């Protein structure tokens, strides 16, 4: 058993575009990092039905990529606004203990909001990955916006998961007008423009209670013109992609790095890559 294990989650609301094929930066892999596990979460339009036939190319790129590392494919989950996939090294994996198991809920009658979640075991230590995606005009169980259901929390479990990550765009927003957030992204003002994000506001209302984000260092990832660093000022700038984690179990989890990737501008979101270190 190892004492500690590490961590690359990934997620991009990355809408209706295409996947990319430099998947290598995309994971955190360019540097030449060897993670025990991986996460990847997208939000969007159209996966489930993938009209473009873009999940043969997913699974032959990111097949070939991974599987020469070491990495074992756990769960992949699409529905038609979500996409959560799991990897973790194959000399990880006892058959035996590893209750791989993944839930997916929905909150409407169109299936189009909500979340999955995909955990297992190794060492005897239990992982939870969760992804959600709720729009802004819904009726819900918390009656908020935010991309919360108790149901995709498995720290609130009887039983609750070692180590549990929460990684997508969690329909957190930031609460001040584009004129003030813009002029605090110009002086780098990144702590008094999270003063006015919404992830306070949201835990204040018991969602996302306990979980932690790490410092965030990187400007807004949202709303950017395409194949530009130019903010468009139609929405306030605001950190969409998030991560989250929690222990459910006292278990030390640190963060090494938290950034958004801003050589990925094929979109109006840029992708978010944290990367962790957790201790068994
Ligand atoms: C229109 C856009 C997209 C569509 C329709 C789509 C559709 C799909 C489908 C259908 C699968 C499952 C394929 C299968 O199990 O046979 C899949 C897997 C996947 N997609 Fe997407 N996707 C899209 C965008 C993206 C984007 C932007 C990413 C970003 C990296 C991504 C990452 C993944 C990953 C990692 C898998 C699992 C690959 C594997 O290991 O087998 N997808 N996608």
Known sequence: ??????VHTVSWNSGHERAPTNLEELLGLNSGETPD??????????????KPQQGPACVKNVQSLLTSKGYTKLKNTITETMGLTVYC????????????????????????SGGIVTSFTIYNKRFSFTTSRMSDEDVTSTNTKYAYDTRLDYSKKDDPS???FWIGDLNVRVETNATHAKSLVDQNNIDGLMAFDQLKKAKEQKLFDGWTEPQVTFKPTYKFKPNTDEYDLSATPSWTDRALYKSGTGKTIQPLSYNSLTNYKQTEHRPVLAKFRVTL
């Open 37 to 50: 596990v991986i996460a990847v979460a997208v939000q969007g339009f159209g996966f489930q039905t993938d």
């Open 1 to 6: 058993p190892p004492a500690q294990l590490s």
């Open 162 to 164: 070692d180590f549990l």
């Open 89 to 112: 090294l194959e000399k990880h994996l006892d058959q035996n203990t590893l209750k791989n198991e993944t839930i997916i809920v929905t909150v409407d009658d169109q299936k189009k």
